[PDB]
Design brief:
The protein is mainly α. The protein is built from 4 helices and 3 strands; from the N terminus they run ααβββαα. The protein binds chloride ion (2 copies) and sodium ion (2 copies). It is classed as hydrolase.
Length: about 130
Amino acid sequence: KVFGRCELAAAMKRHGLDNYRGYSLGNWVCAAKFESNFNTQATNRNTDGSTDYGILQINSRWWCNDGRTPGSRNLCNIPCSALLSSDITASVNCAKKIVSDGNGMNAWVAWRNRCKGTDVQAWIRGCRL
Ligand SMILES: [Cl-]
Ligand SMILES: [Cl-]
Ligand code: NA
Ligand code: NA
């Protein structure tokens, strides 16, 4: 599914991401825009052979099992294909584990490089939430 901006913001609020670990909703919408262009089906291979999956581009090295990333972990205890669903629950629940692991949203390269230190509230402007 390709979400609209405000549709995704509402879904992420319904799932408890607004101010989760102190990150306002606009941070999560901004990260999703630049990680996946709001597309739940997005996949991208990494140089080390791992793959990123879904709206928040969650990595198979640590977080999910895709059957082809040797020596990797599965800390969210899910198949990576679950992260491509039109239902974002699995992606959100795994992202909550990632953002809580000590490095906050710096785990998402695109967030650090394109959202951190910008007016992230712009990403939810106009939306009925
Ligand atoms: Cl959803
Ligand atoms: Cl933090
Ligand atoms: Na915000
Ligand atoms: Na894995």
